[PDB]
Amino acid sequence: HSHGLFKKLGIPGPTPLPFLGNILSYHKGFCMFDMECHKKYGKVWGFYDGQQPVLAITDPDMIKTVLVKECYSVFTNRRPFGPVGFMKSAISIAEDEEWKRLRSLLSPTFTSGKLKEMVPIIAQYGDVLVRNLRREAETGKPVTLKDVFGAYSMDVITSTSFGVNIDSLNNPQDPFVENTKKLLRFDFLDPFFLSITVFPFLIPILEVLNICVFPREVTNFLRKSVKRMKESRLEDTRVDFLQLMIDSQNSHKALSDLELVAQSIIFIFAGYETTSSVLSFIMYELATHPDVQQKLQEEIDAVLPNKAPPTYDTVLQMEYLDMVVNETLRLFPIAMRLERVCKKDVEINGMFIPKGVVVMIPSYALHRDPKYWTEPEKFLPERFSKKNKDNIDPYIYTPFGSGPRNCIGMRFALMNMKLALIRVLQNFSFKPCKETQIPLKLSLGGLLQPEKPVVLKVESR
Ligand code: HEM
Numbered sequence: 258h259s260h261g262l263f264k265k266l267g268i269p270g271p272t273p274l275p276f277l278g279n280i281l282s283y284h285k286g287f288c289m290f291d292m293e294c295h296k297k298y299g300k301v302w303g304f305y306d307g308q309q310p311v312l313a314i315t316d317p318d319m320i321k322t323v324l325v326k327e328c329y330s331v332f333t334n335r336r337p338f339g340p341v342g343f344m345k346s347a348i349s350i351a352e353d354e355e356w357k358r359l360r361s362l363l364s365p366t367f368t369s370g371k372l373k374e375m376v377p378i379i380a381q382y383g384d385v386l387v388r389n390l391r392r393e394a395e396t397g398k399p400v401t402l403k404d405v406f407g408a409y410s411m412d413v414i415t416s417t418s419f420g421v422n423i424d425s426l427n428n429p430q431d432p433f434v435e436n437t438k439k440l441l442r443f444d445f446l447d448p449f450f451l452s453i454t455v456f457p458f459l460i461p462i463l464e465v466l467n468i469c470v471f472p473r474e475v476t477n478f479l480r481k482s483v484k485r486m487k488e489s490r491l492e493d494t495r496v497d498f499l500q501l502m503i504d505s506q507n508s509h510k511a512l513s514d515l516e517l518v519a520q521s522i523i524f525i526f527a528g529y530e531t532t533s534s535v536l537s538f539i540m541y542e543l544a545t546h547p548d549v550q551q552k553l554q555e556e557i558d559a560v561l562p563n564k565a566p567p568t569y570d571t572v573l574q575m576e577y578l579d580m581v582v583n584e585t586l587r588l589f590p591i592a593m594r595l596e597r598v599c600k601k602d603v604e605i606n607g608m609f610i611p612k613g614v615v616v617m618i619p620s621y622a623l624h625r626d627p628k629y630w631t632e633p634e635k636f637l638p639e640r641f642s643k644k645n646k647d648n649i650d651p652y653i654y655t656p657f658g659s660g661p662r663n664c665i666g667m668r669f670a671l672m673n674m675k676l677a678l679i680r681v682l683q684n685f686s687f688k689p690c691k692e693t694q695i696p697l698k699l700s701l702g703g704l705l706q707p708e709k710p711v712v713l714k715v716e717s718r
């Protein structure tokens with residue numbers, strides 16, 4: 258019924274099929290589909306996810322208008338993605354006045370001052386990582402980076418969100434470690450999410466059946482655990498994401514007990530695989546380019562002599578490490594996309610955007626577009642050198658998004674990732690094993706993950 262919207266506005270795009278739109282074009286994934294449409298349609302094109310029209314914009318000025326300028330007025334919320342249950346109070350899922358209240362009451366939790374107080378806690382499990390890394394290195398066999406980084410990210414999440422101190426690699430039995438290990442990213446091209454994308458009318462049916470997109474067993478366990486910790490913390494009468502929220506609940510509007518639980522889980526969901534996935538991507542690019550690995554290891558030793566422990570100020574000093582992280586995020590933006598919902602009829606940069614249309618920014622396509630990048634398929638971390646760090650457009654390179662709805666944990670994630678990278682590199686060096694796919698291929702699903710898990714030879718330095 259709504260498949261003729263983009264034709265009447267003179268907007269190019271793939272011709273849609275009845276009842277499906279262009280979901281069949283997802284056979285290569287969102288990343289490949291967006292890049293092909295960028296080459297075959299220019300700067301602005303459109304497509305349909307079932308009956309939902311999606312407009313893709315690549316003009317940096319338009320991206321600025323959608324994400325920053327007209328964010329509060331028009332482009333405020335993301336598209337609904339399925340039955341959420343009580344998790345509708347999550348900040349990433351909240352909409353309109355609920356989101357603005359929640360972000361205002363949660364912004365101080367991610368301050369630079371509070372982050373400097375969280376560095377020592379994250380540093381403790383960096384030493385835990387190298388201990389398990391040494392045993393894996395002494396074996397003489399290749400090591401999958403997803404598991405060692407997942408154990409590290411899980412350890413950081415448990416100690417930052419709560420007061421739980423666990424070695425996940427050697428103790429995969431605590432209830433925190435078990436349930437949280439199932440908090441993986443959403444494959445939006447799997448049979449379930451594909452079915453709800455074509456059948457959005459089934460989302461309310463799933464909600465009334467108490468069928469939540471998140472595992473119900475994990476959510477109920479975590480909610481009860483917070484209730485146990487909230488009472489136990491009172492009996493003990495701190496640097497915790499929970500404690501910072503508790504210190505805000507007692508002193509816009511207030512924050513509810515169920516809201517605090519919902520935001521606590523979303524932090525785990527936002528950090529478990531995302532941190533580990535980027536860490537695996539970073540180490541793979543260092544192994545195949547040892548010149549970058551050598552210079553980064555030399556820079557780490559210069560700022561931190563004699564294998565010194567990292568500090569908040571020292572992490573921000575290391576420049577080449579920031580270049581490695583940024584360039585890897587350019588090649589692999591694990592979000593792959595940025596989406597906003599147009600809540601009203603509006604014209605942006607001389608273009609009419611009707612209400613209800615989802616506006617999408619192809620982060621992966623822009624990050625590998627030749628117009629803004631030279632040899633985009635190569636791992637050249639020098640693109641972000643201080644002299645060359647200004648030529649890049651901040652709205653073509655959006656790994657953490659932009660505007661008031663960007664990643665609220667960008668500073669925490671960058672510090673957590675960099676703290677791990679300093680410790681592992683100054684003690685270990687990584688070489689490509691035989692099982693490593695030198696031309697590593699990306700998965701064809703809804704996740705920006707490699708086709709095969711990255712395996713790399715590891716040795717003591
Ligand atoms: C490597 C790790 C991470 C990456 C690459 C990443 C990237 C992103 C991206 C691309 C967005 C979308 C922003 C946009 O729509 O404009 C986002 C949103 C968000 N992220 Fe992250 N993120 C990471 C980790 C985290 C962590 C660990 C937390 C929590 C402690 C977090 C909290 C959030 C929140 C709350 C939002 C939604 C903000 C809003 O709705 O106002 N992120 N992130």
Ligand SMILES: O=C(Cc1ccccc1Cl)Nc1cc(C(F)(F)F)ccc1-n1ccnc1
Binds near residue numbers: 349442664
């Ligand atoms: O916004 C993203 C985009 C993204 C970012 C990185 C990797 C993959 C992806 Cl797809 N994901 C996300 C979604 C939700 C929810 F509840 F709406 F489903 C909650 C939290 C996050 N999140 C992840 C990282 N930081 C925040």
